Amino acid sequence: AQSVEESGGRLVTPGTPLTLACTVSGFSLNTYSMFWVRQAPGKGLQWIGIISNFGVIYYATWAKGRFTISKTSTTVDLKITSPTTEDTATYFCVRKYGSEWGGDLWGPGTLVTVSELDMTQTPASVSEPVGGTVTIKCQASQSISSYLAWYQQKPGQRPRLLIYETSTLASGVPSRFKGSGSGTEFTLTISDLECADAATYYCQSTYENPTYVSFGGGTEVGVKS
């Protein structure tokens, strides 16, 4: 079985440096690339940076100087150089799937407490009835061709990949989830809504450049009853 797990999260005082570890099981970091994402409580997902199987690192522009990535044969490490209260978040390491800069295997995340493409997601919130339909729209500042993934995140759980390459369905995801779009305009439609569809959904630019990798703000989806 293939899995991922983060560790190192704890309470810390501003400026006290901290290192998090991401330990993998069932695959080699000689084969797979890994990337780090964070999520402040109540806020959405934010990309930090990526390290290839060959150890080439790319950081988001906002993260440069604030974070260092490094790897062993079995561990990917993230160092927070000089924490502030704005760095209080759950930190996830994610295993990159082959075609794009999206992730198929997420860890449970580790909580840290401290005492340029734009993605526009709409709507913010929506509820439809069981059996209903929900449509989420995602709008990209520049053209990202087919490099778009959709993730599902239940409260207090990790994101699950639903759709990659705009319309391709991940393993185990039912066909009720339909992805479509091209370039700058993308949509996810959930047909025959169920109880188990209530979650937050995020679009992500999986374009293979650190300037272009971006998460939408999220969309709370409810089910009426």
- Those residues whose C-beta lies under 8 Å from the C-beta of residue 167, and which sit 6 or more positions away, are 146, 178, 179, 180, 181
For residues 35 and 47, is the Cβ–Cβ distance under 8 A?
yes
Report d(CA 26, CA 22) in Å as an integer.
14
Q: CA dihedral in degrees (166, 170, 172, 174; nearest 10)?
A: 10
Report d(CA 33, CA 31) in Å as an integer.
7
- Those residues whose C-beta lies under 8 Å from the C-beta of residue 32, and which sit 6 or more positions away, are 24, 53, 95, 96
Resolution in A: 3.6
The angle formed by the CA atoms of residues 34, 37 and 43, to the nearest 5 degrees, is 165
Report d(CA 185, CA 172) in Å as an integer.
26
Q: Which two tokens stand for residue 86?
A: 């704005």
Phi, psi angles (nearest 5°) of residue 61: -60, -40
* Type of residue found at 4: V
**HEC secondary structure over the chain:** CCEEEEECCCEECCCCCEEEEEEEECCCCCCCCEEEEEECCCCCEEEEEEECCCCCEEECHHHECCEEEEECCCEEEEEECCCCHHHCEEEEEEEECCCCCCEEEECCCEEEEECCCCEEEECCEEEEECCCCEEEEEEECCCCCCCEEEEEECCCCCCEEEEECCCEECCCCCCCEEEEEECCEEEEEECCCCHHHCEEEEEEECCCCCCCCEECCCEEEEEEC
